[PDB]
C-alpha cells in the first residue's frame, strides 16, 4: 500500500488568448477625473492609454472570451480541459468559484477549478500549477485565466493610482510536450510590505462603519519601486538559472506591466540584450494586475515579432510584496 | 526552459488545527432561530459547533493551525517554500492572506497565494503542494485552510445557521521515498450554480441597503442529491487512480457537510467496517474548506490509526464541485 507510481511527462503552453475592453481611455480623459496632466502620466508611468471595462464586461465575460481564444489557438476543445485555474483579485462574489462558472460556460464540464488570489503574481502562480498538474501525469490539458477589473477596486477620482490600472483578461492553455516547455517557478515575499499595497478597508469594516467605505487599493509606490528593483531583479535571474538559461538565451521578456520605468530598470539591471523582444503593453493597456503578463504574452505571440519554441521570461510582482515567475518556451503563433 | 529537474515523491509530514474557544450547543442555536435540538441533530448529526470570537480572525486561526503542523512535522518556517491558503470568508482583496501568514509564521523564504474553491479548497491545495514538492521545485509546502463561515451566514436564518462553524486546519507536505499522496480527482456540475451561491455580491451591497451583506444561500435537497450522485463515484475514482480499493483504507475523511450525507457516502461507497470515518461535524459543524483539514488533524492526533495507513480525503460543494485524493497518513505526534 505504497500507492501507484504515476507516470510524469513534459508540458508547455499550447495556446494563448485574451480579451481587451472595447472602451479605450487616453490620459486626456483620465485628467478629467483627477487633477493631472497627460504629460505626467507617461514620463512617470509610461501609459498613453488604458482600456476600462464597461458594465457588461464582467470578469467572467472577459475570462470566458480570453479562454475561448486560448483554446482556439491551442486547437483544444473544452471537453479536453481537466482543470481551470482563474487568477483574480477583483471578484466580489465569495462563492462559488469564478473558475467553475467559466468552465461551465466554456463547455468544460469535465474539469474542476479553483480561483487563485495572489495580486499581480497571480498568472505566473497559476501557470506553474498548470505545468506541475500536467507533468504529474494527473492532468493532460489545463486552462489558466487571469481576469481583472482593477477599476472596481480603485478610485478613479484619486490621482494616487487612478492613472495606473487597466482592465482585461488573458488566458493560456498548457498541455503535453516532448521536452520541458515550462521552467520551475521562482517565488518569494516581503512581509513588511503589507503596508505598501493594501486595501483602504475590508468589506467587513464597510459594514460596521461606512465612514471608511468601499474597499480600494492604496499604495506607497516608492517602497514597492525599491522592492521591485531590490528583489524582483534577482528573482528574474533565478527564474533564468533554475530553468538552465541566460539573459542572452531569451527571445522575449514579459514582465508584469507595473510601469515602463520599472520595466526600463529591470531590463537594465538584468542585462537584457537589444535583440530580445520586451513587453511594454502598458503603453496602451495600462496596469492590468494579474492579467498583465497574460495580456502581454498573448500580444507577443500573436505579433510575429518572435518565433515559436524560443525561451521567454515571465514574472509578476506586487501586493503583499511577493513575486512569481518562470521561463517558458513560447508557442507557435496562431 | 530546457532542463530536466529531479523529481521526488511527497507525503504529509504534519497536521495542525485551531478550534475557536467558544462551543455553541444546538440549544443555544435554537435561541437564534425557530427550531429544535432534535430536528437539527436528526437532519445533520450536529450536536454542537465552534463559533469564532472577534479576536479569532482567519489569519490568527491560520497561523496557529500552521504552527501545530510545523511543530508536528519538525519543519522550520525558514524551510517552507510555498504557503497556500484556502478560504472563502476573506473580506480583504489584497494582499494575499498566505503572504500575511507566511510573514508572521517566520517563513520569509517562501512565496504563496490564496486559494478559493468553496468546500473543495483543502483538497485542491494539497494536490498543488504534492505536485510542487514532487516536481523538484519546492521541498516543503504549507497548506492552510481557514474559515469563518459564520461571517457569511445570517445566524438568524432558519435554513443553514445550524450547519456552519469556524476554524482552521493545516498540513505540511514534504519529500517521501515512496509516493505518499495519490493523484487528485476533481470535477464540477455547473448547472448547480443556483443551488449554492451568495445572496448578493459586495457590488450589489454597495449600491442598495437592504440587500444585506453577502450571505450563503443553498438548496439543501439539491446539494445533497448531487453529492450522493457525483461524490460517490469520485471517491472510488480517487482510490483507483492511486491504485487502491476501499478495503486497503484505514480512514475516510470526507468533508463534514453533515453526518446524514456522510452516512450515505459510506454506505454507497461500501466502506468496510474496519475503516475509521471522520464524523467531526458532530461537534464541529461544517467549516467549509477547513472541514477536511480539521478532521485529518483530529484523526491523526487521536491515536486511532497508524502512520503510513491509506486515507481517503474528498471535499465537495460549491458550485457544484469537488476535489479529493488518497494519501498515506503521518505518524501521530509525540
Ligand atoms: C499588483 O499586485 C499591482 S501593481 C502595484 C502598481 N504599482 C507598481 O506596479 C509600482 C508603481 N511605482 C509607482 O507608481 C510610482 O510610485 C509612480 C511614479 C507611478 C507615481 O509617481 P511618483 O512615484 O514619482 O511620486 P509622487 O510623490 O506620488 O508624485 C511626485 C509628485 O508628482 C506630482 N504629480 C504631478 N501630477 C500628478 C498626478 N496627476 N498624480 C499624482 N500627483 C502627481 C505630485 O503628485 C507629487 O508631488 P510634488 O510635485 O509636490 O513633489
Ligand atoms: C462548500 O463549498 C459548501 S457546504 C454549505 C452547503 N453544503 C452543506 O451545507 C451540506 C449540505 N447539507 C444539506 O443538504 C442538508 O442535508 C439539508 C440542508 C438538505 C438538510 O435539510 P432537509 O432536506 O432535511 O429540510 P427541508 O426539506 O428543506 O425542510 C424540511 C422541513 O424542516 C422543517 N424545519 C424544522 N426545523 C428547522 C430548522 N432548524 N431549519 C430549517 N427548517 C426546519 C421545515 O424546515 C420544513 O417543512 P416540514 O418540516 O413541514 O416538511
UniProtKB/Swiss-Prot annotation, chain B:
<keyword id="KW-0511">Multifunctional enzyme</keyword>
<dbReference type="Pfam" id="PF08541">
    <property type="entry name" value="ACP_syn_III_C"/>
</dbReference>
<protein>
    <recommendedName>
        <fullName>Beta-ketoacyl-[acyl-carrier-protein] synthase III</fullName>
        <ecNumber>2.3.1.180</ecNumber>
        <ecNumber>2.3.1.300</ecNumber>
    </recommendedName>
</protein>
<dbReference type="GO" id="GO:0006633">
    <property type="term" value="P:fatty acid biosynthetic process"/>
</dbReference>
<comment type="subunit">
    <text>Homodimer.</text>
</comment>
<keyword id="KW-0443">Lipid metabolism</keyword>
<comment type="function">
    <text>Catalyzes the condensation reaction of fatty acid synthesis by the addition to an acyl acceptor of two carbons from malonyl-ACP. Catalyzes the first condensation reaction which initiates fatty acid synthesis and may therefore play a role in governing the total rate of fatty acid production. Possesses both acetoacetyl-ACP synthase and acetyl transacylase activities. Propionyl-CoA and isobutyryl-CoA were the two most preferred substrates, although acetyl-CoA and butyryl-CoA could also be accepted and elongated. Involved in the biosynthesis of R1128 polyketide.</text>
</comment>
<dbReference type="InterPro" id="IPR013747">
    <property type="entry name" value="ACP_syn_III_C"/>
</dbReference>
<keyword id="KW-0012">Acyltransferase</keyword>
<keyword id="KW-0444">Lipid biosynthesis</keyword>
<feature type="active site">
    <location>
        <position position="286"/>
    </location>
</feature>
<keyword id="KW-0276">Fatty acid metabolism</keyword>
<feature type="active site">
    <location>
        <position position="119"/>
    </location>
</feature>
<dbReference type="Pfam" id="PF08545">
    <property type="entry name" value="ACP_syn_III"/>
</dbReference>
<keyword id="KW-0963">Cytoplasm</keyword>
<dbReference type="GO" id="GO:0004315">
    <property type="term" value="F:3-oxoacyl-[acyl-carrier-protein] synthase activity"/>
</dbReference>
<dbReference type="GO" id="GO:0033818">
    <property type="term" value="F:beta-ketoacyl-acyl-carrier-protein synthase III activity"/>
</dbReference>
<feature type="active site">
    <location>
        <position position="255"/>
    </location>
</feature>
<dbReference type="GO" id="GO:0005737">
    <property type="term" value="C:cytoplasm"/>
</dbReference>
<dbReference type="InterPro" id="IPR013751">
    <property type="entry name" value="ACP_syn_III_N"/>
</dbReference>
<keyword id="KW-0275">Fatty acid biosynthesis</keyword>
<dbReference type="GO" id="GO:0044550">
    <property type="term" value="P:secondary metabolite biosynthetic process"/>
</dbReference>
<keyword id="KW-0808">Transferase</keyword>
<dbReference type="InterPro" id="IPR016039">
    <property type="entry name" value="Thiolase-like"/>
</dbReference>
<feature type="region of interest" description="ACP-binding">
    <location>
        <begin position="256"/>
        <end position="260"/>
    </location>
</feature>
<comment type="similarity">
    <text>Belongs to the thiolase-like superfamily. FabH family.</text>
</comment>
<comment type="pathway">
    <text>Lipid metabolism; fatty acid biosynthesis.</text>
</comment>
<dbReference type="InterPro" id="IPR004655">
    <property type="entry name" value="FabH"/>
</dbReference>
